[model samples]
Target: SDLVSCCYRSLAAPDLTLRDLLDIVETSQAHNARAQLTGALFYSQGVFFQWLEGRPAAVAEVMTHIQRDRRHSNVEILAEEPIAKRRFAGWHMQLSCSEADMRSLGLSRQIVTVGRSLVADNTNIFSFDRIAAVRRFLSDVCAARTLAPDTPVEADTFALYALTEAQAGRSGRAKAVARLSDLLSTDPLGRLTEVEELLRAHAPTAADFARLFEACAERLTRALAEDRISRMQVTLAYSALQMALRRIHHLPDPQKSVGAVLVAGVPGHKPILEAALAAEMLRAVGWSTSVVHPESVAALAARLKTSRTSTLVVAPSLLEGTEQEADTLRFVSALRARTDLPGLSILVGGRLAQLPPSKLKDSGADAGFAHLALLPAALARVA
Candidate 1:
């Protein structure tokens, strides 16, 4: 079964105390156990920080209940994703708010229990039998509780929790390279299992996920430059990572799509990878796209109309020749000739996009992107 790790922060009702917490914890344990859920909760300084790992439906039901709880205010989700495995295994739920935690979590006495049914772990959740990295992460979580109220506690990079990792030696980027390589390995059919194992071993917080993704993508780019990986390999990585991204993040409505793709019939192998990365980034930022390959410019205009597509991304093949450039302009000219598509906005990217606007003035292109990252903002302009 797939597991999702979901966490959130909320304010405690002013009237809550250790006595009140006891009942909450007991009731939660019963309910969570029934739903086959496992996780942890820490209450400090009139604030509550909780995480749950289980099936999507189970987690969703619990979240719905908590959001409706009068005891919680400003219940913002800190992170949510379909994780590779449960972080707090064997325990239905763990709690860690001890007397010493009063100074840290603003509560008192040893009570590491899930207010949502924390399976107290025989005390090992915070003691001997735990993931070292999780302990460091809990310390960070408790430290962040100093603000205690409404605040955003999210940012980049993968090392924060990696410090105390049991695996010890590999740098975050090194691990990412290994995972990326695994994703594009010879046994492509086994990629899902590899991805699951990777996540189970290092279930990163959302902040770490973004940084990890970028690092992997960049590493893939370097491999492409060195001519060590295939186009299909990069596409495989892109496909796997994009699914993860989609699970972690929300996208814009289908009605408001940025109809985009690589230029059709482009012969260069590199442009396919370029377009692959660009399409992934586009989806991440908030646009829906597809790889549209039309046999003719007029046909592309027709395809756009059918999809109700608004923006057409015309990327150069990067074959690097005057004839290639001439051919690109020839296609763009045909695209502009169509008066039928009212919102068929054309834009350019890839190597040729580096040339000044004057160079593309006669190409019938509306704008140019030197790189893929800027394409979304450029879309914002055209939209």
Candidate 2:
């Protein structure tokens, strides 16, 4: 448990060359891998910020090399502390943010222009106020990540690719997805092994896999919908697939257990597919998860109380109507009235593209989501 972390601010030298950046990246991959180090790097208009963490001595020595690099100047240490768990477990390029990216944080163009030219001698221009502004932006990212340790800072990033693939019709990525889906019935283990290979070769993050789950769920849900699959048939179909997807620790799941989640949805592959995605996403963040179909409010209540499960993620049925919405409210309200399961937190999903905020709130649930990508961050707040 001798892990520690450090972050610093520096100015990328005015004359820094693309090759110099390339060399820094290439050597970092080699050296940092050997040292078991992990971190994030961000550059904005000539301003640089990097956070590195690992074995204390390794991180310390790495800092020395970074200080000597011709690409950096006026290095200023911002924070250093021992961390019980890692904030970042691996490193790959992520989209960098700038003052323009966080304009909602109340930053003005003129002030951002001043902060862009950071230096000690120019403290008059980039004053303490400007430094605090930078710190504030960093703090928000870490706070979102602190609860869900592997949470991506940038929002709405991964899901777009799947939608693009959908519009384009049978993209190469979609073809690969189809290949992966085909094996669920016959070659589950072989598929998992292939996934592990992808992990080593590409180092896709948990967020990336989460997006894949969303894409898979969307495709399956649609396919099932088009065929108008029956409840019992979809249930049996998903039981096999969900069971196959279970506890594949060979894939990238967090070591720490957050808690257990029961994703209960209505009968049909609609619930089945949503539950499959929800289960894996929760499990990725270290929750032991199970999928179920609760026929009645009382039955659902009895199950939650007996299992001592604190969290319930509800996946909506493929069926849609006023009666269906009313049934959902009926289900949630009756269970909420019981004192036996007071701590239960229910999260509703499925067909939330429009985000029925009022409808979800009226159901007495703790949270509801329109998108799969929002699930991880919502867990942080509800807990």
Show the colliding residue pairs in model 2.
none
For model 1, how does the per-residue alpha-carbon lDDT over 1-383 read when each residue is reduced to its tens digit? 58898877665664566666777778788888999887777664355678788999999998888899876565767678888866666446556552323443355323432221121211112111123333345545444443452443332111344433423434644665576555754433456656644543443333234334445555666677688877777666655654544454433323333334433434332344345444554554335667665666667777766777667776444322335566667677777777466556777765557688888776677888754445554665676
TM-score of 2: 0.45
Q: What is the lDDT of residue 196 in candidate 1?
A: 46
Per-residue lDDT of 1-383 in model 2, one digit per residue for the tens?
88898887776664555455556767876788888887666555445767788989989999988898766665778779998977666552122335332342333211112122222112111122233444444444444545665544442321232233334433544655666545443444546566444322322333344444555555656656677554454344455444534433233333335567788874322465456666665654456677787676677777888889898877665423224455656667777886466677987655542456776666687786655655655665586
TM-scores, all models, native as reference = 0.41, 0.45
Question: How big is the RMSD of model 1?
Answer: 13.8
